[PDB]
Design a protein around this ligand. Structure first.
Ligand SMILES: Nc1nc2c(ncn2[C@H]2C[C@H](O)[C@@H](COP(=O)(O)NP(=O)(O)OP(=O)(O)O)O2)c(=O)[nH]1
Ligand SMILES: [Mg+2]
Ligand SMILES: [Mg+2]
Length: 425
DNA sequence: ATTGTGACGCT
């Protein structure tokens, strides 16, 4: 009753950019705007692999991970932008820099946790307290939430249903109680409207946001009304939402763990989790997962918004599939040097921008026919931002995989260099 | 012959 804490302390938002790499290319190339288009990596093998799709193109069934030739079968007027290639590999620099544009704007409003190239969490609890004090009890106008959806409303066209849901939400608000969680979420959603307006005005990119009380609900909410919309998921809307929410839709249950939850417990939806005691979940899925699951199916999650705007690692990766697998010593050296050269450029820029230095170089390889994605992961010291030195050290650290008596065997299907263990500089 | 990243957990 009174002592059952509800995980309504925080206001957390998740902002994710809509079809981000396509928007970056559409800003640079006006001819792609308001068109079915996608961004691919490479072009020789089946026209390249798609990693980003505009919503127009999605209406035709185009998705990420499709080959571009297959996508063209679904969508014959599809436009394609290609990722830059450098030293024979995909170069994602332009999007990392567009990302930084967006992150720098988000940082003005609150402390953010970069969750990926195109998305960040925001802890808005302090900002909402401030804005609540400034309103001095003034009610909240639907003008202030022009793109906000309220999940589970209305109850009892799209813009119409959205505005109906927003009016039902706003007429039920107790605006006098500075401590009502629902009010706090509302004020958060006003601030997130302002943040998304600033992002679009200062970059031309559009995004969606989830506003809720924790990261998992914010992230789930963010997807509910993409594109170019934001969704408030209240604590009170969790039971209905989760009663038909497949377990795999929750961040981190989309894989092996989620499948075991489904299979062992004999359930399909998030809501059904509430019928198990914490100990039952801890027995089946370990003590941590169990605690996390017991709280999560009630809408409660405690993972903090970490103050971390920058990646913790900087890495360069390239597959060598099938008959392009590296089979000679010269080949492994030339590609370790290409990877090391890109890594060096990125690290030198990181040092000058962010006043820090990586201290550990990780080399990962896959050998042909291996089942695993990574066959060997070995670390060594990183003492200089010198590509020739890094590549030589990667070779020294992996050379004892070669079973040849000039040749390389088994042939390498992946090289991966990664700088980690950063330190102030 | 999705590929290229990046976080975090387990032991
Ligand atoms: N290299 C590479 N880049 C990828 C991959 N997957 C995604 N990206 C890149 C391209 C993506 O633009 C970007 C962000 O990924 P999302 O937020 O998951 N997708 P988006 O923003 O496109 O659409 P939505 O509106 O649904 O959020 O990361 C991949 O497998 N490989
Ligand atoms: Mg996105
Ligand atoms: Mg994303």
């Amino acid at each position: 009753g009174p002592h059952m804490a509800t995980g309504q302390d925080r206001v957390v938002a998740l902002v994710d950019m809509d079809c981000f790499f396509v928007q970056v290319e559409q800003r640079q190339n006006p001819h792609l705007r308001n068109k079915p288009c996608a961004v691919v990596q490479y072009k020789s093998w089946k026209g390249g692999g798609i990693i980003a799709v505009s919503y127009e193109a999605r209406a035709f069934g185009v998705t990420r991970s499709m080959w571009a030739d297959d996508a063209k079968k679904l969508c014959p007027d599809l436009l394609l932008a290609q990722v830059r290639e450098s030293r024979g590999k995909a170069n994602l620099t332009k999007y990392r820099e567009a990302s930084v544009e967006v992150m720098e704007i988000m940082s003005r409003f609150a402390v953010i946790e970069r969750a990926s190239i195109d998305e960040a969490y925001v802890d808005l609890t302090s900002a909402v307290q401030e804005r609540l004090q400034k309103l001095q009890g003034q009610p909240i106008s639907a003008d202030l939430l022009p793109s906000t959806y309220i999940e589970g409303l209305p109850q009892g066209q799209k813009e119409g249903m959205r505005k109906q849901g927003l009016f039902q939400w706003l007429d039920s608000l107790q605006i006098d109680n500075l401590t009502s969680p629902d009010l706090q979420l509302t004020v958060g959603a006003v601030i997130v409207e302002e943040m998304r307006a600033a992002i679009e005005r200062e970059t031309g990119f559009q995004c969606s946001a989830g506003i809720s009380h924790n990261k998992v609900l914010a992230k789930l909410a963010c997807g509910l009304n993409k594109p170019n919309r934001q969704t408030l998921v209240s604590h009170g809307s969790v039971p209905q939402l989760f009663s038909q929410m497949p377990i795999r839709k929750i961040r981190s249950l989309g894989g092996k763990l989620g499948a075991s939850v489904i299979e062992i417990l004999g359930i399909e939806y998030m809501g059904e989790l509430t019928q198990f005691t914490e100990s039952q979940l801890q027995s089946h899925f370990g003590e941590k997962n169990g605690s996390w699951l017991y709280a999560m199916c009630r809408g409660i999650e405690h993972d903090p918004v970490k103050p971390r705007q920058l990646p913790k690692t900087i890495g360069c990766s390239k597959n060598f599939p099938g008959k392009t697998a590296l089979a000679t010593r010269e080949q492994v050296q030339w590609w370790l040097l290409q990877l090391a050269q890109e890594l060096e450029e990125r690290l030198t820029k990181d040092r000058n921008d962010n006043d820090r230095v990586a201290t550990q170089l990780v080399v990962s390889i896959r050998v042909q026919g291996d089942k695993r994605l990574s066959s060997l992961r070995r670390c060594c010291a990183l003492t200089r931002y010198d590509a020739h030195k890094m590549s030589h050290d990667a070779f020294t650290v992996i050379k004892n995989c070669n079973t040849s008596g000039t040749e390389w065997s088994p042939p390498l299907t992946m090289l991966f260099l990664c700088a980690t263990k950063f330190s102030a500089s």
